[PDB]
Structure 1
Amino acid sequence: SKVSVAPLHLESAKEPPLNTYKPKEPFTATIVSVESLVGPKAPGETCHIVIDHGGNVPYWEGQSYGVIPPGENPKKPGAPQNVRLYSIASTRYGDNFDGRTGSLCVRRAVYYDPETGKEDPSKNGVCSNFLCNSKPGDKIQLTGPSGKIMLLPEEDPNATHIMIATGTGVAPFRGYLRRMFMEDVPNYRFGGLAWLFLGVANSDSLLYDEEFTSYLKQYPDNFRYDKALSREQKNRSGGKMYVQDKIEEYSDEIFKLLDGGAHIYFCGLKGMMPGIQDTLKKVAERRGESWDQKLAQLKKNKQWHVEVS
């Protein structure tokens, strides 16, 4: 049932690759495909981009690629554009299971006048629209990979991993979950609990939902999946349902899991963190615990994984 992947020598590296390519001399990769991930009612367009790196820019799950969009740096004529980082949304084997491609999950940054709603493409995000406008055969300047915070701890193949995403923050977790459940990786046989929480605006904004729903069916004892749709659902207080509200609903079980050594991951919008922190603080304090001290301990034990912006 698990999908054969190749080449298995991608498992041989003892340390993660880092900054194999730098902005001074990027790797010229090639677009394989670009597809919209979302339906018509989604507030923004999010696309899935498959990139052929030919095996020259391997990575581990949870890392990022840098992309240098074309054109001159506007705040520095003569200079190339600044790198934009994107969380890799694929396993190290990639979506074609061959170790030649990696995938990105990209939200089109688009400017609307607050009063007249008029989109203004001159104020749109350069790299995100460059990427989602790409077509098979287009060239892309790649740097990296980079990142260590979101590397998956594999020392315990029965560990618990609590994955908290908003929007494109789901990207590393798509990679984690394929490695845990989809791909035939003989040296990593996951038998723990993986728990994905995903917050998006509405059902049309969900990302990779059919893939995650399939894991529920195939691995009911090892995978849990909870969604917060902020424009379509209300929390117990009658406000918009955010992922912090779903965390609160399970806060007893989550704290028990953390106390037992679970890893917790946060990826996506930085704006989700204050509300999430308040929720965990409330739960720690009811139990008689200092959240400041508990969080410090979680970080010391390497259980606390944050990459937001």
Structure 2
Amino acid sequence: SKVSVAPLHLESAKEPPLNTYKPKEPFTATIVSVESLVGPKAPGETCHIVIDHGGNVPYWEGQSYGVIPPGENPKKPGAPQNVRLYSIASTRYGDNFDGRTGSLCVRRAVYYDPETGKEDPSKNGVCSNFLCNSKPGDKIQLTGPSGKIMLLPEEDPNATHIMIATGTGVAPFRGYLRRMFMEDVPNYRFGGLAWLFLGVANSDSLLYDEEFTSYLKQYPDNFRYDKALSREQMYVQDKIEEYSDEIFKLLDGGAHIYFCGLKGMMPGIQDTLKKVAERRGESWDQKLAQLKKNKQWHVEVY
């Protein structure tokens, strides 16, 4: 049942690519598809964008692409816009299983007057709206890839990976999980435990839910999946708390734990972890220092 992927030479590099393309000479990639991931009751749109890089901008799971949106830099006359980074949401083979495309999971940044709700196109986020407004055949200026914080540690194919996402923070984990479960990668046969926790606003805001639910049926002994709906139920930290003893035992046994999404997710998580630890009679500060020393703690928030 795993999906054949090509070309297998993408497994041969011993280090991830970094800064293959730079802002002064980006790679001009082409949009394959853009689709909304969310339903009518979601508070805003999050879209899935598939980009054809032609095999010219390969990457490893957990890396980011840069995108240079069109127009002048408003702060620097006659200069290009600054790069915006996006976590790649695909495996290195991409959604067409061919090594030619990568995907992004992009939240539209829209401004609303806090009193009146009135819009202002000069205040929306440039790159996120550029991307979600894109159509097949459109060109995008791609840079990178960049980043190493979120590379998947593969030395132990039986490791445990606890993945904590809010919103678009799911992106690297979609790539991890396809590599672990979906794709036929003969040199990486995952036999550990992957546990995804996802916090979103409501059921219509869920991202890739059918995919993750399918892994529960395909790999019941290797995958777990828990959701938190803040407006319906509940934050992701409340779900960690529900499983606190299991999680703390996995951490003590060597599990990796990952956090990705908007940085506002982290204070509540740190508060919860401190309280859980205290109830167990442990110091969260001591435990976190040990997790960081042991290279178990991975955070990419923005």
Deviates more, 1:119-128 or 1:224-233: 119-128
Q: CA deviation at 1:289?
A: 2.5
Q: CA deviation at 1:286?
A: 2.9
Scaled by the length of structure 1, the TM-score of the pair is 0.96
Give the aligned CA root-mean-square deviation in angstroms: 0.8
CA distance in structure 2 between the partners assigned to 1:17 and 1:225 by the alignment: 31
Q: CA deviation at 1:115?
A: 1.3
Q: CA deviation at 1:300?
A: 1.2
- Equivalent residue of 1:72, what SS? coil
Unaligned stretches of 5+ residues in structure 2: none
**Post-superposition CA distance 1:30-64 (Å, at most 9, x none):** 10110010000000100000000001100000000
Q: CA deviation at 1:189?
A: 0.5
Q: CA deviation at 1:284?
A: 2.2
Any runs of at least 4 consecutive aligned residues in structure 1 with deviations exceeding 6 A, and if so which?
none
1:116 maps to 116
- Equivalent residue of 2:151, what SS? coil
- Equivalent residue of 2:77, what SS? strand
**Post-superposition CA distance 1:187-225 (Å, at most 9, x none):** 000111000000000000000000000001111111100
1:143 maps to 143
Q: CA deviation at 1:291?
A: 1.6
CA distance in structure 1 between the partners assigned to 2:232 and 2:259 by the alignment: 23
1:303 maps to 296
Q: CA deviation at 1:279?
A: 1.3
1:81 maps to 81
**Post-superposition CA distance 1:158-211 (Å, at most 9, x none):** 110000000000000000000000000000001110000000000000000000
Q: CA deviation at 1:269?
A: 1.5
CA distance in structure 1 between the partners assigned to 2:216 and 2:119 by the alignment: 39
**Post-superposition CA distance 1:245-278 (Å, at most 9, x none):** 1011111110000000000000001111111111
- Equivalent residue of 2:263, what SS? coil
2:60 maps to 60
CA distance in structure 1 between the partners assigned to 2:151 and 2:284 by the alignment: 25
- Equivalent residue of 1:289, what SS? coil
Q: CA deviation at 1:113?
A: 1.0
Deviates more, 1:120-129 or 1:56-65: 120-129
1:236 maps to none
- Equivalent residue of 2:35, what SS? strand
CA distance in structure 2 between the partners assigned to 1:52 and 1:106 by the alignment: 16
CA distance in structure 2 between the partners assigned to 1:81 and 1:95 by the alignment: 28
Unaligned stretches of 5+ residues in structure 1: 234-240
Counterpart mapping for 1:1-309 below 5 A:
1-233=1-233, 241-309=234-302
Q: CA deviation at 1:293?
A: 1.8
% identity of equivalent residues? 100
Q: CA deviation at 1:283?
A: 2.1
CA distance in structure 1 between the partners assigned to 2:82 and 2:216 by the alignment: 40
CA distance in structure 1 between the partners assigned to 2:255 and 2:53 by the alignment: 34
